[PDB]
Amino acid sequence: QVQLVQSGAEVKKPGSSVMVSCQASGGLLEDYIINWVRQAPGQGPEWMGGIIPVLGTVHYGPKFQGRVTITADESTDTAYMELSSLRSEDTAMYYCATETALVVSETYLPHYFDNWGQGTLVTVSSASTKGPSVFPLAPSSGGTAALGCLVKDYFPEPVTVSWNSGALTSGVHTFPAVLQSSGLYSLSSVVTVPSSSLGTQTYICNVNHKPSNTKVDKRVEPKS
């Protein structure tokens, strides 16, 4: 029932340093073991480290010690992870995960992750932040038609999309982004719907690319 809210996804330049925050709501940071796990595309998760404020102990994975700093701000119940000298290998989704530390003895260690943040996609690249353009995929003329909108030319991932402010979910298919030859990511979101509601129903795709501060609400309907 405690939700872990991490900082937003962003693109950082190679060699620079990144800071990711992780906000706890509903409990104190001292009452948990706060862990940081990362997942590169096509790999399993890798544990980076964890801090136990009730004991005042910080632990770093051997690969990351000396370039990772994890702190616990008990004044705001926010945990942080700072990784310096960023390079291509670091492009991964970074997760903030907790283990409850209510009754702990000394030399207590992290063991598992029962409560997770949403994850923060850090992309290390030279390219600039760029917001996407959204274009309708209008339906036309059995008994079910399809429509959608196209989210094109953004950087970096991810882009989010919801139908009817999240109301329309049964039958939505939001495809994974594809990196085009020109560069930048592009993505499609289609949903099937009965052909009798093509004129009586409004279908809006709410596209958000938080890294670029882009909020777009695109209406889809046939033309004339």
């Binding site: 009754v103 702990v104 003895s105 000394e106 030399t107």
Partner: protein, 39 residues
């Protein structure tokens, strides 16, 4: 287990012969440990 006893009427005493010895002549010391965690 063959034990022979002799009683001497002259001195009103009795000797039970045939037993064997097992005398504690030394000490062996060992340290037994249990690993604890203090909460």
């Amino acid at each position: 287990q063959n034990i022979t006893e002799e009683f001497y009427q002259s001195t009103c005493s009795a000797v039970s012969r045939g037993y064997f010895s097992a005398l504690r002549t030394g000490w062996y010391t060992s340290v037994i440990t249990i690993e604890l965690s203090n909460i």
